[PDB]
Every structure is written in structure tokens, then in C-alpha cells.
Amino acid sequence: TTSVLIRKYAIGDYSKLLEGATLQLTGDNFQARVFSSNDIGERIELSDGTYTLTELNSPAGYSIAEPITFKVEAGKVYTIQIENPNKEIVEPYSVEAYNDFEEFSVLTTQNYAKFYYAKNKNGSSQVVYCFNADLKSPPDSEDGGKTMTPDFTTGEVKYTHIAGRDLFKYTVKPRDTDPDTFLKHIKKVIEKGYREKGQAIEYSGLTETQLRAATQLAIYYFTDSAELDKDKLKDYHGFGDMNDSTLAVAKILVEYAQDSNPPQLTDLDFFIPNNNKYQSLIGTQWHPEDLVDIIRMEDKKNLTLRKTVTGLAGDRTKDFHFEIELKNNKQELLSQTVKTDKTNLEFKDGKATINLKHGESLTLQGLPEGYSYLVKETDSEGYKVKVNSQEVANATVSKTGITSDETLAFENNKEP
């Protein structure tokens, strides 16, 4: 068996698991079961196979998220076919991270003062960097990370340790638009930047702390679209105090990140705070030994067809038949169950047929952003077909990139 924890998160705020979603786990061949999402995730030991996580209902406010299919094979877990990117600690929001308030080292005239660390399982401290420029730094510590300043409202501010994959979504004002491109940029910055106390500094004349600042500002280039310009930085989070040298190294880190070479680092710890006011933190180290597979589901905050028969010679009890062809954002055909105001509809190779009599209607729900339809009424022979009052010789119409709901009102006229 393989341990998994199903965790339900809320898209865009990861400071707590979203409780109160009714989730059902169904598998191909054990017993299917229903449970409600909790604060730590539902722990299940699974034999090899393919399983489906469905949201039977979501908690007040949210939308039903897409069924997540996954596979447990040979002790490993996969999403659908790639490797489960969600590896997190068993007890969430249990990791201390801190800002070392007493450590002192200048950029030019002033303490850098952004000495962020996270505590590894073994009590050592890894250098980490803020991933959200406008959010709060980790809790001040006056004693090197033994005790921390709690938040006035939420108590201690502790973190969930996770594999730093899928980082795009934690950014506020990223520069990139493709997540993988974004991840590759972050890994590369960390790679060539400051990772370990005592490390050789390859850039002549720069102190450890100066490299650390260049590294942090390079992250902000990508996470918050910081500009790497002396004069535009005069008042940006203390970075006016960064000398020319250091800023030149920040541009080197960013230019490196930007080039086509692949990242030499396979993975990086990442840390999410249990208070959304606090910044998330990208690590410089990797501790896979502390992590288990999570099946993650994320909650967020329609096409209608109808038939009317007209004319005195129009039959009002004839099952008119439609052949609907649907493709997604990237022109792939949908091969999924699609719920409706009547019954479900299995789309095979993007297609399903439906029958409508005069004055009936069917409403396809949960169709994705930027979809496209091609709809034909196959058995029109004899009728003058009009769709939304437009004359269609071939009883077939199309539309691409539907950003809203849409209604196709077929009218069939058999006038004597």
C-alpha cells in the first residue's frame, strides 16, 4: 500500500486547508467512500490502481472543482500521466521560519535586514527568500530562531513545507506567463545565488550578504516584476542601499535565469505561511525525506441547446438530433462526463449526440474557458433551419473561444 493524504485547498489562499468540501474517492477495483475535507488532509493507504476524487459539493462560496484522476503504481503516485508534484509534510503549518532580527550586515550604508531562514527537521536553519515582496516577512526572532514573535491575531506563524514545483500560483505580479518557464527561472536564480552560510562567493568584492540581496532581488524580478534599475529602485524595499556591484550581480542572476540552459537543481523546499498576510518562502535546500504524497484539490470562487418547431406542418413530437463537437483552450477534444439539467453526457472524442423535441432544452454545465463548439442538427431534411434566428443551409454552426455562457436556439420551419 501507499500512503496518500487528500488535501483540499482554496485557489489563491493557501494558509489553511479548505474544510467542509464533500469529497468522494472512487476507484476501478477496496470500497469507494465519502468523507469531508479536514484541516490536515485525509490519510488513506491505497493498493495499486487508478482512483478518482470527485467533489459532490463544495462549501458555501466556492465552485465544484474538476474531478482529479490519479494512479498509485509501485509505491509511487501519478497525476492525470506525470509524477505527483504535490509532496507535503504530514502535519501542516508545523515548520518554524523566521527573520533573524539581530544578524547584521550591510548592503552599502544600512543593515540588509532581510535575513530569512526556515528550520529544517533537524534544527539546522536553511537560508530562504521571500517570494512575495509586498507581504510580511517571517516572524522576527531576537535569539537566532529559538523563539519567534507571534502574529497578534493568529498566534505563532508556522509553515507547511512542500516541494517547490507549481510555484507560479503563489506569485502576485509575475513577469512570466508560463508556469514551467517561471519555475525554471526561480531554480536558476537560487542556483547561482546565495545558498549556504560560508559559501565561496564567485563575484569579486561582494560579501555573503550582498550576494544574498542580489539573489532576493532577482527572485522579485520574476515574482513581483521588480525592475533592475538603480533609479527605479531608489525606494523599493530597502534596495536603494544596494551598490552598483551588487545590482550588477542581480542582473547576472536574472540574465542567467533567462537563458536557455536548464536548471542544475532538481528541486527546492518551499514554505507556505499559515497567515495570508505573510510572504511565502522559496528555499535554498532540498529535504524530500520529510514529505509524503498529497492529492491536492483546489477550489475557486454553460451551453444551452433548444428546439422550436414552427409552421402548420411542423411535427412537435419529433426527436430532433444534434451532434455536438467540443474542444478546449488548446484545441483538444473533451473526453469527460459533462453534467446537465437532465442526465450526464459522456463525450467521446469530443462528441455526444442529444435529442430534443419542440420546446425542450438541454444545458451543458461546467464547460471550460476558451472552449469551442461545432453543432449540427443531423436530421433537418424537410425543415428550414434557423439558429438564433439566422438561416443555416447546413443546419450547422460554430463558435470558438466562448468566454461566457452561450445559447443555440434552433428553429425548424416546415410550412406547407
Side-chain angles (χ1 to χ4, degrees):
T1 80
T2 306
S3 307
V4 311
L5 288 66
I6 307 300
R7 282 183 175 163
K8 180 74 167 74
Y9 288 98
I11 278 191
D13 175 321
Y14 302 109
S15 55
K16 51 162 213 76
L17 278 41
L18 184 60
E19 306 199 67
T22 298
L23 301 170
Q24 183 189 238
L25 192 70
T26 270
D28 86 59
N29 125 133
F30 186 74
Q31 300 178 326
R33 77 286 305 278
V34 178
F35 55 101
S36 92
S37 59
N38 64 0
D39 60 347
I40 78 192
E42 186 74 12
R43 171 54 148 291
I44 329 173
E45 308 296 307
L46 292 345
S47 301
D48 283 352
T50 293
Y51 296 84
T52 295
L53 180 59
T54 324
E55 181 158 31
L56 303 174
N57 59 62
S58 83
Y62 299 82
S63 307
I64 282 175
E66 215 87 47
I68 288 282
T69 304
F70 69 96
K71 196 194 205 185
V72 171
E73 187 191 319
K76 318 211 77 185
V77 172
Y78 307 85
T79 51
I80 15 278
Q81 176 67 68
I82 39 100
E83 209 165 294
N84 182 32
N86 306 112
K87 290 222 172 106
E88 310 182 358
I89 54 165
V90 170
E91 211 212 340
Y93 316 112
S94 70
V95 165
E96 287 169 340
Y98 63 91
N99 160 47
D100 190 340
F101 202 86
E102 293 280 335
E103 169 167 13
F104 186 110
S105 203
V106 302
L107 291 189
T108 303
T109 70
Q110 299 271 112
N111 190 353
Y112 175 52
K114 309 184 160 63
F115 296 110
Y116 308 141
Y117 308 87
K119 287 175 104 177
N120 290 321
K121 204 214 196 215
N122 76 334
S124 56
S125 289
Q126 85 172 260
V127 172
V128 293
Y129 300 97
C130 179
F131 208 75
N132 301 135
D134 297 312
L135 293 179
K136 283 173 182 144
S137 61
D140 296 339
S141 171
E142 210 82 19
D143 59 14
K146 296 191 198 172
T147 69
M148 271 63 62
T149 296
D151 189 79
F152 187 55
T153 55
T154 71
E156 297 168 65
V157 186
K158 287 164 149 162
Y159 298 73
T160 289
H161 171 205
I162 78 186
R165 310 162 172 174
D166 199 6
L167 295 179
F168 188 62
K169 62 172 132 220
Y170 307 99
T171 70
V172 171
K173 195 181 201 178
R175 201 176 256 290
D176 301 313
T177 73
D178 170 293
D180 293 335
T181 306
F182 172 78
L183 182 65
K184 163 160 2 165
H185 293 165
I186 300 294
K187 291 168 162 182
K188 290 174 78 185
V189 175
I190 292 299
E191 178 192 312
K192 272 205 166 267
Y194 182 70
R195 302 184 61 202
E196 215 213 0
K197 307 233 78 166
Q199 77 174 63
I201 305 317
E202 71 184 277
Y203 309 99
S204 195
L206 256 81
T207 66
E208 290 188 29
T209 293
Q210 287 163 1
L211 187 54
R212 194 171 179 159
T215 301
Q216 178 68 78
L217 177 60
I219 294 291
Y220 292 158
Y221 179 81
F222 289 109
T223 61
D224 298 78
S225 310
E227 276 300 2
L228 298 177
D229 189 74
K230 190 74 172 300
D231 181 299
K232 294 191 79 85
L233 292 162
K234 74 190 290 154
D235 211 300
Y236 183 80
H237 296 295
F239 284 103
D241 185 53
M242 181 176 282
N243 71 22
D244 286 348
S245 301
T246 304
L247 180 56
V249 168
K251 279 145 142 164
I252 284 166
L253 295 188
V254 164
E255 287 173 329
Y256 171 63
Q258 273 169 328
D259 72 33
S260 297
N261 294 298
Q264 296 301 108
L265 303 169
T266 70
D267 269 301
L268 279 183
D269 301 325
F270 192 85
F271 299 92
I272 306 174
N274 72 351
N275 173 329
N276 45 66
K277 288 167 180 177
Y278 281 79
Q279 56 178 162
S280 281
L281 300 176
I282 181 53
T284 61
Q285 291 181 22
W286 178 227
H287 296 80
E289 335 86 35
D290 306 349
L291 312 169
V292 314
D293 290 274
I294 296 336
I295 299 307
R296 224 170 135 103
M297 186 181 251
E298 305 204 340
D299 291 261
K300 182 152 135 69
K301 291 161 191 327
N302 297 308
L303 173 50
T304 332
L305 275 69
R306 329 186 199 261
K307 178 62 186 207
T308 46
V309 183
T310 65
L312 273 134
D315 195 288
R316 318 272 199 177
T317 41
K318 172 161 178 297
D319 270 316
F320 280 84
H321 286 102
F322 305 84
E323 187 164 343
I324 307 170
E325 200 216 57
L326 307 179
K327 315 202 207 162
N328 60 22
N329 229 34
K330 311 163 175 154
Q331 281 75 51
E332 280 156 51
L333 297 149
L334 296 153
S335 302
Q336 64 199 70
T337 341
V338 166
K339 269 175 182 174
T340 72
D341 49 5
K342 306 189 177 146
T343 47
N344 293 347
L345 231 71
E346 290 268 62
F347 277 92
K348 279 189 185 177
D349 273 278
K351 297 174 207 193
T353 33
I354 64 164
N355 43 1
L356 298 159
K357 304 171 196 196
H358 155 76
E360 280 183 341
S361 61
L362 210 282
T363 318
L364 288 60
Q365 298 173 355
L367 291 166
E369 167 83 323
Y371 83 98
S372 67
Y373 67 76
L374 176 71
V375 177
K376 169 160 186 169
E377 199 185 61
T378 45
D379 46 20
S380 47
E381 39 269 48
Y383 295 84
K384 246 76 155 299
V385 171
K386 279 178 165 181
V387 171
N388 302 332
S389 69
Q390 167 65 35
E391 245 209 330
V392 287
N394 305 70
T396 303
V397 300
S398 59
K399 183 182 282 257
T400 57
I402 292 91
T403 55
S404 65
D405 292 330
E406 273 291 333
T407 294
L408 287 180
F410 276 86
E411 186 198 359
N412 294 291
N413 185 40
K414 186 145 181 162
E415 207 78 50

